[model samples]
Target: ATFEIVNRCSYTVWAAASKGDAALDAGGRQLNSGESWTINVEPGTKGGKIWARTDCYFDDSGSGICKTGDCGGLLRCKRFGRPPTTLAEFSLNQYGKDYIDISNIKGFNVPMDFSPTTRGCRGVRCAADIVGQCPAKLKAPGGGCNDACTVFQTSEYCCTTGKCGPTEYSRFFKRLCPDAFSYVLDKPTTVTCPGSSNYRVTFCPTA
Candidate 1:
C-alpha cells in the first residue's frame, strides 16, 4: 500500500490523491520534473484515485486554479477532482490482493505509468501523445483531451439509457494506449499485485 509518485514531465505537475471527498498527500503537492513523493494507504481502501493537475497556480495559503483536474481550486483538496484527467484508480487489499488500473474514461491530460515493484507483477501505462493527436471535437480549453462521454452526453457513449459499445472516440484512445480503459465498458483492464507491494505512478514516464 505504499506509492511512489514521480514527476517526469518537463513542466510542473500537482499530484493529487483522493478517496471520495477526502484528499491525500497533504491535499496535493507540487512536483517539478524529476521530483517525487511517497505515501501509504490503508488496506481495503476502495474507490480512490490518483491523478495529475497541470498549469496550476497556488498562493502561499495553498489555493489556486488549474487548467485540468481541478478539485475546488484548493491546493489541499477536500473533494474529488473534475474531468479531463488521466486516472490511476486503485483498490488496496481487496480480497487477497491489491488492484490498480489506468483509466481514460474521463479524458487525458498527462502521460502515466502505474507499476508494482514486487516480483512477478507487471505494470500498465498510457504514455502516448494523446493531446497531440486528439480529435478537434474532444479538445479541452487547456492542453487536455476530452472524452466523448462528456462531450456528447448521450446514451450511445455514456451507457446511460442502454448497453453501450465502443465508438470512434473510444478507438481514438485505444489506438494510443490499448491497455487503458478507453471507455466505460472496456473489458478487464486491471492488474493485481501483492497486497503490500510498493507501487510507482510516473507522470510522463519514458520507456
Candidate 2:
C-alpha cells in the first residue's frame, strides 16, 4: 500500500497515478528535484500504474496539460495518461504477491526505476536515452519517443488481433531495456515480490 515516488531529475516533474481512483494525489504533485512523496494506495487496486508528467502548468482548479503523460488536462489522473510514457505498473496483493513491471509500450519519455524496498527481488529499470535515440517516425512532437503503435496506429504495430512478430521498432526498445515489455507481444517481463513489500519509483535512474 506504500509507494514512494522520487524525482531525481534536475527539473520538476508532476507525478501521476491511475487506477480510476483518487490515489493520484487528487491534484497530482509537483516534485522538484531531489524531492519525494510517499502515497498510500488502496488495497485490491487492480491495474494500478504510476508515471511522471513533464513540461506542465496547472491552474488552481488543477486544469492543465503536460507535454507528456497528460491525463485529460487534469492534475489528478483518474484514467490513463497520454502516451509516450514510462510506466510502473502493478497489481497489489494479487494471489498474495505484488506483480510489478516497467513498460514502454506507449513509448519512453523519461527514465525510471521500479523496485521493491525489501530487496527480495531485483529491480527493473529503463534509463537509456531513448528520446534522443528514437527513430524519426516514432518521435513525439514534444520530447519523448512513441512506440510503433503510438506512431502508426496500425494492426501491424498495434496488433490488437492476429499473429504479430517482433519488428525492428520493438527490438529497438528491447535492446535498450531487456527487462521491460517492448511491444505488445513481447515476452512477459513481469516480476513478483512478496505482498508485504513496499515499492519505490525513481525518475532519471540508472538500471
Candidate 3:
C-alpha cells in the first residue's frame, strides 16, 4: 500500500508524528478541526498511528502547548461539546475500549507541505493509494471505492486516488515515500471523515 496525498489543509507549516500520543492543533489551540476515519479489523489485529507535526508544534519555551494545544486550557477549549477525558484518553477510540493498539507502532509519515488555501485550516494532509490486487477486491463491494470499509482482507485496497481512495493520495504518496512505505505496526489515532462519517478508528502507519 502507498500513502498518497489526499486533501491538503490550508497551512504552510505541516508535520507528522508516530510513537507517542500527539495533540491536535488549531490556531494555537487544540480543537476538533479534522476528519475521523473508521477502519475494518479482524477482531484481534490492530493498526499503528503517526501524529501530525507542523500542527503539532513545539517551541523553545515548552509552552508550545499554548501554541499547539500542548497546554491544559487547550484541552478544555478543544471540547467538541462532548464530555472530557485524559490528554490522549479523551476519545473513546483513542483512550477507551476497542482503541487500536500502540505497543507495536513503527514509523510516522506526514506530508511535507500543504496548499496556500489550507494555510491554517485543520484537515487530513494525505490519502491512501490503491494498487494491483487490492482495488479489484474493494470494487467488489458494489458501492465502488468511495465507500470506506470496516473490514478488509488480503483484498486490502491501496490508497490510490481517482481509483481506490481519496484523490489526495495520488498526489502526495508518490511525492513523499516514492520508494516504499512500511506498515508493520498496530497503533491508533483520532481521525475524522467529516461530512462522510465521523468517528474514532485505528490508523496503521505506512512508512
Candidate 4:
C-alpha cells in the first residue's frame, strides 16, 4: 500500500505523515506546486495521518516555524500535526478493512481530497474555500478556520463529556465540507473499504 501526497496550492507546503510514533518521511518533504511524493506502507500500518504545513521557514538543521499546521516546530514529526490543518486519516487492516477520511475536526488550513486509487473504495474530499469564509470567532491568525473545540474549548464544543454533538459552530464547517469531520464526535465521517488500496491526498485541490 502507499500514500501519495500532492501539492496543488499556489505556494509551497511542507508535507508530513506518521503512523503512531513512526514518521513516514525521514525529514518531511518540501512540496512546491504540482509536486508529489509517495510513501510505501506496510500491510498493518495503522493510525496513519497526512497533513501539510504552509508558509514555513526551516533551517538546514531542521528547526523553524510554520504559519499553519506546524508539528512541534520540527521538519520531521513523530506526533500529530498542529490544529488548523486539513487531515487525511486512515487505519488499514482494522477489522479487516481500511478506514479513511478527510477531517477538519482539528480545523482546516487547506482544501484537500482523499481518494483511493483502487476499486471498491469511495473517494472523500473537502474542497471548499473554508479559510475564505471562516466565521469571525473561528478564524485562525494566518490562514485557516479554527474548529469550535480549538477556539471555544468548552465541553459542548470539545465533547469532553462524551455526550456532545454538533453545534452551530460545527455546522459552519459541515455546511462547507459535508463529508468531512466537523467536530470531535461527529459521525459518518469514516469511509471503509477492503484493505491494501493505495490512496492519494491532494492539498488545495482547487488551486
Candidate 5:
C-alpha cells in the first residue's frame, strides 16, 4: 500500500489526507502522505475479523476536490485471496499541471479491477474453517461439508464455474451481495460490471 505524493507544482505544497474504516481503531483518523501504512487492527492473532479503510485527502481547507486520471491496484481482495502489493503511479505530467493543489481535492481516480487468488483459501484447516464461517450462497458444495470435503469438492469435484466452499468477494461481489460480507476480490474473480454474468444487486445505497 505505497501512497506517494510528488511535488508536481512549481512550489512544494503541504497536503493532508485520511482513509475511513468502519472496523477501524480511533474512528479512522488522518493518514500522512509519502508512505504506505497499515490500517490499524487489534492486537490478537485471530483471523476472520475484517479490515477496511478509505484513504482520503484535502488541499488544506478540507472542502472536497476529486482527482482525475488513474491510480490502479487490486480493486478488491477476498480475505487475502488476491492480495495486491503495488499501487499504480500517478503521472503528474498527464494532469496538465505539474503542481498538486492541496485545497480540497478528492484524492485520485482509482480504477476498480478485481483479480482472484487462492492463497489463504488453501491448506487443510484454513479451508475447513472458511467453509464453516461462510454465508449461505457460498455454502460448501452439496450442502454440508467439512474443510477437507470443501477442498476436494472445490479442487477436484464437479468442475462447474460455481464457487466452492466459499465465494470470493470484491467491489464487484458487493454489488451482487451487498448485505452479505464482502472483501476485496483482487484477481481471478471481479466486480467488473460490463461482463456477461455480472448481476447487480445493491452494494451502494440510494442517495
Candidate 6:
C-alpha cells in the first residue's frame, strides 16, 4: 500500500493524509517546488483521504491554521479536511479492486490530479484553474471555491432530504472539470483500478 505525492507547484505545499485507525502522516511540513514524497500506507487501510493544505502557518508545536483544508487547526490531520479543498478519496481492497476519485464536491482550492501507475488503470483529473473562475457567491474569503451546498446549505443545493439533481451551479463546476464530483448526484466520479496498483497525487500539475 504505497502512494507517491508530487508537488509541481512553484511554491511549497503541506500535504496530509488520514485513514481509519491509522496514525496521521505528513504533518505540516514544507514540500518544496518539484519535490515529491512517497508514503507507505499500512495494509488493511481503508477509507483513506489525501489533500494539500495551503497558506498554512504553524508554530514549534505544529499548531496553526491553513487558508483551506484546516483540520481543527492541527498540523497532523486525524480527520477530513475542511471545505474548499481538493480531495483524493480512496477505498482499498474492495470487491476485488480499488476505487479512487478526485472530489470537488466540497469545492476546489488548488488544482489536483490522480492516476494509477499500473498499466491498465485509468486516470482521473480535475486540473482546471477554478480559483480564477470561482463564482462570486461561492468564493471562500481566504481562498478556493465553495460548493453550492456550502454556500446555500439548502435541500435544493445539498440534496439532503429530497430528490435532487444538478443545478445551474453544479453545472458550472462540471463544465470546468468534468472528471470531478460536481455535486451529490455526480455518481460517475469514481474509477475502479486494480488493487495492487500504486497512485500518484499531484498538485498544480499544469506547470
Query: Which candidate number has the best lDDT?
Result: 1
> Per-residue lDDT for 35-113 in model 1, tens only?
9989776677887788999999999988889999999998877677777999998888778788889999999999999
What range of 10 consecutive residues in model 3 has the weakest lDDT sum?
80-89
* Local distance difference test, each candidate: 0.88, 0.86, 0.24, 0.86, 0.21, 0.82
**Which parts of model 2 have CA positions greater than 4 angstroms off?**
20-27
Q: What are the per-residue Cα lDDT tens digits for candidate 2 across 1-207?
A: 788999999879999988755554453688999999888877666788899999999999888899999989988787788888898988888988888999988889989999888867877898988988898888999878999988888898888886688999999999988888998888989998887678899999752
Decide which is better by TM-score, 2 or 3.
2
Measured over all alpha carbons after superposition, the RMSD of each candidate to the real structure, in angstroms, is: 1.4, 1.6, 17.3, 1.3, 19.1, 1.7
lDDT of residue 54 for candidate 4: 88
Point out where model 1 deviates above 4 Å: none
- Displacement of residue 85 (Cα, Å) in model 6 is 0.6
> Which one wins by TM-score: 2 or 5?
2
lDDT string for model 6 (58-98, tens) is 88888888898888777777777788888888887886788
- Please provide TM-scores, in order, for all candidate models, with all chains considered together: 0.95, 0.95, 0.19, 0.95, 0.19, 0.93
Candidate 1: pairs in clash: none
lDDT per residue as tens, model 3, 35-112: 332222122112322223224344454334322212232321222111000011111222323331111011222222
**Per-prediction tally of clashes:** 0, 0, 42, 0, 28, 0
* lDDT of candidate model 3 versus the reference: 0.24
Q: After superposition, how far is residue 166 of candidate 2 from its true place, in Å?
A: 0.8
| Lowest lDDT 10-residue stretch of candidate 5 | 196-205
Error of 2 at 182 (Å): 0.5
